[PDB]
């Protein structure tokens, strides 16, 4: 029934690397809709945002700004060049390993996001919600990042660990991602 127990990667040649594929268009198209609305309004001060947020954008988001426009020019069709081969992408990790410092600045600013948008932030997302048709609360897009780098974590793992052919750099792209979040928490000071 509905569970997971006799294991189910996915349905078609590219299990997992579809998984990866698609959470780039997923990340990208994300953050589109995140700038667009909720960033959008609070920098063109066309509502009346509180008092708290207003120069918080940057809070309230973090830098999700960057994330965008790298991914969409960059990892995205980077890594549809790898559709053909899951073998690969160890190296896309990689190759932009060092870029992955980003996420241990996005992640540092991420709770007290948090409190922003709780307490001094308000209702005020509800009502542009209904004007763009967004159906999804604030809170989700901003921490969705940190369900995705768990994504990232899972499909790594499942290609080094099973690719008969681990050419490389697998283990690298691992160590990489691990040490982000590891980083942020070591490297406290926001």
């Known amino acids: 029934g509905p569970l997971g127990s006799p294991e189910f990667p996915g349905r078609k040649k590219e299990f997992i690397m579809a998984e990866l594929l698609q959470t780039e268009k997923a990340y990208v198209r994300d953050l589109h809709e995140c700038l667009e609305t909720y960033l959008w309004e609070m920098t063109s001060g066309v509502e009346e945002i509180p008092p708290g947020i207003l120069n918080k954008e940057h809070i309230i988001f973090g830098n999700i700004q960057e994330i965008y426009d ?90 080094l660990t099973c690719c008969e052919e681990g050419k490389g750099e697998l283990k690298d792209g691992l160590e990489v991602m691990l040490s982000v979040p590891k980083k942020a928490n070591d490297a406290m000071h926001v």
């Open 70 to 159: 790298f991914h969409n020019n960059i990892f995205l069709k980077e890594l549809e060049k790898y559709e053909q081969l899951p073998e690969d992408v160890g190296h896309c990790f990689v190759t932009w390993a060092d870029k992955f410092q980003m996420y241990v600045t996005y992640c540092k600013n991420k709770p007290d996001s948090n409190q922003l948008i709780l307490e001094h932030a308000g209702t005020f997302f509800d009502e542009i919600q209904q004007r763009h048709g967004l159906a999804n609360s604030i809170s989700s897009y901003l921490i969705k990042p940190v369900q995705r780098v768990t994504k990232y974590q899972l499909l790594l793992k499942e290609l």
